Amino acid sequence: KWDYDLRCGEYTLNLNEKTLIMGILNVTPDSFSGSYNEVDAAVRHAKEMRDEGAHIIDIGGESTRPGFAKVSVEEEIKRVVPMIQAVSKEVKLPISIDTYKAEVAKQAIEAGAHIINDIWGAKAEPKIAEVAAHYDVPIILMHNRDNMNYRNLMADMIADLYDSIKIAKDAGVRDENIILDPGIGFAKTPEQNLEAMRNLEQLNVLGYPVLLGTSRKSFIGHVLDLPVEERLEGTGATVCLGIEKGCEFVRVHDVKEMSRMAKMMDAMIGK
Amino acid sequence: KWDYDLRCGEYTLNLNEKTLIMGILNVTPDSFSGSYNEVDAAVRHAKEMRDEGAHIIDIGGESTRPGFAKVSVEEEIKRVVPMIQAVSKEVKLPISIDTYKAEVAKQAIEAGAHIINDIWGAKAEPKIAEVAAHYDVPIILMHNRDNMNYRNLMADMIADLYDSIKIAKDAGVRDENIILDPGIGFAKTPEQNLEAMRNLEQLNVLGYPVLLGTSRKSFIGHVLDLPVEERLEGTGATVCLGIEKGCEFVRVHDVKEMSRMAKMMDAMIGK
Numbered sequence: 001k002w003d004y005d006l007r008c009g010e011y012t013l014n015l016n017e018k019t020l021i022m023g024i025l026n027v028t029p030d031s032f033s034g035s036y037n038e039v040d041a042a043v044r045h046a047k048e049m050r051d052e053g054a055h056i057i058d059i060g061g062e063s064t065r066p067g068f069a070k071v072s073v074e075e076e077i078k079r080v081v082p083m084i085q086a087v088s089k090e091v092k093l094p095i096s097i098d099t100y101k102a103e104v105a106k107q108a109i110e111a112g113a114h115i116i117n118d119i120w121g122a123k124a125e126p127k128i129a130e131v132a133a134h135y136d137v138p139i140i141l142m143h144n145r146d147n148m149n150y151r152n153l154m155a156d157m158i159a160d161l162y163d164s165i166k167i168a169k170d171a172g173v174r175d176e177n178i179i180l181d182p183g184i185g186f187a188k189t190p191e192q193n194l195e196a197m198r199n200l201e202q203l204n205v206l207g208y209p210v211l212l213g214t215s216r217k218s219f220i221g222h223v224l225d226l227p228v229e230e231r232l233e234g235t236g237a238t239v240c241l242g243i244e245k246g247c248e249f250v251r252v253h254d255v256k257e258m259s260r261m262a263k264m265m266d267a268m269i270g271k
Numbered sequence: 272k273w274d275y276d277l278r279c280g281e282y283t284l285n286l287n288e289k290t291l292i293m294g295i296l297n298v299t300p301d302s303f304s305g306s307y308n309e310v311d312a313a314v315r316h317a318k319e320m321r322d323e324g325a326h327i328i329d330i331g332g333e334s335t336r337p338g339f340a341k342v343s344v345e346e347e348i349k350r351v352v353p354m355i356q357a358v359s360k361e362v363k364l365p366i367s368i369d370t371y372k373a374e375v376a377k378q379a380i381e382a383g384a385h386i387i388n389d390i391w392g393a394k395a396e397p398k399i400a401e402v403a404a405h406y407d408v409p410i411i412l413m414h415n416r417d418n419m420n421y422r423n424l425m426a427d428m429i430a431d432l433y434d435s436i437k438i439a440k441d442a443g444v445r446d447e448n449i450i451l452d453p454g455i456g457f458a459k460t461p462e463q464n465l466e467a468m469r470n471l472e473q474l475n476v477l478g479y480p481v482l483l484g485t486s487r488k489s490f491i492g493h494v495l496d497l498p499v500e501e502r503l504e505g506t507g508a509t510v511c512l513g514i515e516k517g518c519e520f521v522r523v524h525d526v527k528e529m530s531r532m533a534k535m536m537d538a539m540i541g542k
């Protein structure tokens with residue numbers, strides 16, 4: 001199916017043999033504070049996920065709360081750089097950096113990170129694509145927008161995704177460095193979120209690997225009527241349908257559980 | 272989609288609004304023994320499953336071990352009848368009887384059970400279809416066979432299923448009383464089991480509701496390489512793909528978990 005491999009510095013990801021699991025490592029400060037406690041705790045969680053079946057570590061320090069502190073750019077670099085340096089040293093796994101800021105990604109790669117995960121799809125700081133250009137890394141372009149005016153959800157999603165790919169390409173990014181994401185949980189009502197799930201397969205005609213990020217999200221809450229810590233089965237279900245719909249990556253909190261489900265789908269869908 | 276409802280005595284099952292969960296109640300004696308302990312324990316488990324989201328209780332006393340006792344027909348009636356009588360009295364839910372024996376089903380319905388679940392698809396005791404005829408109950412016809420010679424798995428499965436439907440129809444069973452089951456885990460290698468999963472959708476052209484029974488099965492074990500008590504995620508995955516492939520029933524051990532997954536799929540597939 002894919003006639004190429006995802007090239008990340010010393011690591012090489014195969015897009016055909018199995019659904020690739022991206023482990024979420026949330027590194028967002030809950031107060032102003034680098035210290036051993038945090039970095040150490042991030043490493044052990046990364047190690048856990050590696051043990052549990054993860055193929056990628058997604059380090060993000062921009063989660064949007066509640067309970068998280070507002071962090072300025074130069075502050076996020078000081079916080080997120082040490083995290084990257086230690087994890088990539090003790091956890092032999094490619095790391096993505098979950099940011100939409102250009103100067104953050106720059107420093108994250110320099111500090112040893114391999115993939116950019118942009119939740120704004122180069123739209124917030126188009127500069128980020130140039131950083132993606134230079135260091136020649138894979139960049140994940142997520143569907144997002146600043147409003148919810150959709151004529152036709154899927155058609156508009158695909159349009160926005162292409163506007164992103166354009167910015168990427170014009171800055172220098174090769175096709176083989178581009179991953180797409182429907183941005184489930186972003187600027188979509190619970191109903192649109194469902195629709196986008198139901199119609200994921202359409203993104204495949206763009207010709208890029210697709211990554212899905214639905215782990216624990218509110219729309220699962222809305223359907224199942226369940227708080228964030230009780231959305232494993234919901235998440236599960238989304239991961240299954242996402243894989244049946246042709247996704248190549250899933251970005252999840254429950255690496256152990258999700259990994260077995262991804263494995264069971266791969267067998268069934270014949271991956 | 273379905274222009275009718277599944278009619279079970281006092282209960283009425285809608286085949287369009289949600290994937291219907293069948294709770295497994297295993298009532299197979301592990302030694303020669305009716306007594307309060309057993310019947311009481313079966314009731315509390317039935318109640319649990321009702322609380323957990325089950326829409327049907329499948330009482331079977333013919334599970335094939337290891338550790339279960341060989342039980343003669345007149346012995347199984349004495350054991351399984353009390354179970355039925357108590358459960359249907361204290362658990363307001365339709366009950367199916369998991370047998371391929373004709374005289375068992377007869378007595379099970381008489382004792383208050385609403386659906387027949389035949390793992391041999393009327394092939395073992397065609398008489399069973401006449402019992403299904405008389406009491407006018409829904410009967411589940413499972414794919415099964417006494418050998419593994421398949422020219423073409425799906426085509427042969429569909430053929431066998433029709434041979435079953437024929438026996439059913441000739442004995443008197445109405446179309447609206449027929450449910451089909453691919454018999455995952457029966458006379459199928461782990462590879463065929465997967466194939467049958469991957470191609471489930473084909474059974475839909477027969478025009479009957481399809482029930483899926485994959486809970487905890489060995490082929491999940493073989494893929495995931497995990498013992499029977501660690502196949503929740505595997506099972507999950509099968510249930511998801513089964514629903515995406517158009518199933519209307521799932522027959523499972525982990526009612527709580529599976530119910531949330533079924534619920535999340537229904538939302539996504541728009542049921």
Ligand SMILES: C=C1CN=c2nc(N)[nH]c(=O)c2=N1
Binds near residue numbers: 183184185211
């Ligand atoms: C909550 C988040 C934060 N970052 C994400 N990044 C990607 N790529 N996809 C997501 O769904 C996602 N959700």
Ligand SMILES: C=C1CN=c2nc(N)[nH]c(=O)c2=N1
Binds near residue numbers: 369388390411456484
């Ligand atoms: C192990 C069992 C016992 N009875 C069953 N009955 C049905 N209908 N389907 C199954 O998959 C099944 N598995």
